[PDB]
């Protein structure tokens, strides 16, 4: 047998899946995940896939730092994954502009408060519920010349010239972060 390698975390909005190599040839795998002081919990028992969904475990506490390892079968050979702290590393999904209403000389651009995989009371918490104040949205618009705005909520209130039509695009951002601080730009919307 050969130990797995290139263990990588694929996480967006807390949907976290561990991936690895190589493509199993006469060998199966079993994944174990834990917190530094917690017990090891097994997942994807004897799977032949080269991936393992660990979402249900990490959403139990997104602020904890998890370590996972992949056991190889024809103590067993294994490889550790990098440490993973959900709250600080899960990628922010592509946002969606929910709407925008013009009121005189101003426009209110609202950003959809998308849900995450974090469960709570039989429901999925929104990106706002999870990050609270650590999350802000940035607006990149233009008169149809670049313009930008920032909000700590899910809405932007900006000035617009009467008659002219504008186009908008937003990004979810967690300023305090060091890695994956921003999501990709949302689709472009035009009034």
């Amino acid at each position: 047998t050969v130990a797995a390698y290139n263990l990588t975390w694929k996480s967006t909005n807390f949907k976290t899946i561990l991936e690895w190599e190589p493509k199993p040839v006469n060998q199966v795998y079993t994944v174990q995940i834990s917190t530094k002081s917690g017990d090891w919990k097994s997942k994807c028992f004897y799977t032949t896939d080269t991936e393992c969904d660990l979402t249900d475990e990490i959403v139990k506490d997104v602020k904890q730092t998890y370590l996972a390892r992949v056991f190889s079968y024809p103590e067993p050979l294994y490889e550790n994954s990098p440490e993973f702290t959900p709250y600080l590393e899960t990628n922010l999904g592509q946002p969606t502009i929910q709407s925008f209403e013009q009121v005189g000389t101003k426009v209110n651009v609202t950003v959809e408060d998308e849900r995450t995989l974090v469960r709570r009371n039989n429901t999925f918490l929104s990106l706002r519920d999870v990050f609270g104040k650590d999350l802000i949205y940035t607006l990149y618009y233009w008169k149809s010349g670049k313009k930008t705005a920032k909000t700590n909520t899910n809405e932007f209130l900006i000035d617009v010239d009467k008659g002219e039509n504008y186009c908008f695009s937003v990004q979810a951002v967690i300023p305090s972060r060091t890695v994956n601080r921003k999501s990709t730009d949302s689709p472009v919307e035009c009034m």
């Binding site: 917690g38 017990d39 090891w40 103590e75 294994y78």
Partner: protein, 254 residues
């Protein structure tokens, strides 16, 4: 025990104190009224085999009370594969001349089944190690029974996380590391033979034996314990056997 705390009297009921000629020798673990599991190396320099005593219900070596029960050790069984002066197969099964009385202060630790221990107990992060050993490397032994919670490591991690040294003992499949590499906590020489007990769903089980390590709580090193799961069958078969004429007995392993 380095960096631990006193085990409140009665909270380490399976802990055994082994003496030779009345002198402190090693620790041990009671697993039933007549049998005690300790470390093989504890007997490397024993001359008077008829003077080995096992004390149960001990706590404070400077005060005597009614929870103490002494028993002559009628037999010391060591694997034929163990070599004095070394570290592999560091385990000994001791038969007490007379069974001890089970009380609130004298209770045996459970010897688990092999697969349960390998598949479940081995992945419980923390376990307790205890004894009246040195409080510091090269220091004095303890008067009151000490206990410490240490995390277990798979051998591959132990090796990768330990300072690569010269030709030191190898970590075999009959051992496992546990503890810390920052020089703060670990068991020590005088704790040898004592239990490495694992708590799982309301019950404690014997998973290891204080065996060896480079110094005690040495930066870049972990304590090493005999991997008891490898000896479950060996132990069970011996406990069902008849005693031999002499005290020392070497039984084949496997």
């Amino acid at each position: 025990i380095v960096g631990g705390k006193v085990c409140p009297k009665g909270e380490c009921p399976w802990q055994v104190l082994l003496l030779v000629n009345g002198a402190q020798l090693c620790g041990g673990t009671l697993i039933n009224t007549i049998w005690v599991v300790s470390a093989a190396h504890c007997f490397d320099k024993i001359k008077n085999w008829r003077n080995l005593i096992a004390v149960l219900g001990e706590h404070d070596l400077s005060e005597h009370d009614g929870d103490e029960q002494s028993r002559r050790v009628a037999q010391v069984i060591i694997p034929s594969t163990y070599v004095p002066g070394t570290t592999n197969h560091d385990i000994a099964l001791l038969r007490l001349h007379q069974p001890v009385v089970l009380t609130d202060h004298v209770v045996p630790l459970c010897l688990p089944e092999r697969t349960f221990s390998e598949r479940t107990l081995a992945f419980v992060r923390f376990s307790l190690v205890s004894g009246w050993g040195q409080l510091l490397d090269r220091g004095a032994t303890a008067l009151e029974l000490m206990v410490l919670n240490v995390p277990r490591l798979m051998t591959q991690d132990c090796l990768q996380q330990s300072r690569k040294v010269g030709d030191s003992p190898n970590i075999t499949e009959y051992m496992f590391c546990a503890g810390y590499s920052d020089g703060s906590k670990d068991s020590c020489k005088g704790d040898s033979g004592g239990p490495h007990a694992t708590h799982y769903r309301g019950t404690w089980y014997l998973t290891g034996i204080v065996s060896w390590g480079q110094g005690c709580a040495t930066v870049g090193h972990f304590g090493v314990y005999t991997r008891v799961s490898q000896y479950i069958e060996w132990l069970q078969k011996l406990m069902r056997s008849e005693p031999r004429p002499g005290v020392l007995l070497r039984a084949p392993f496997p």
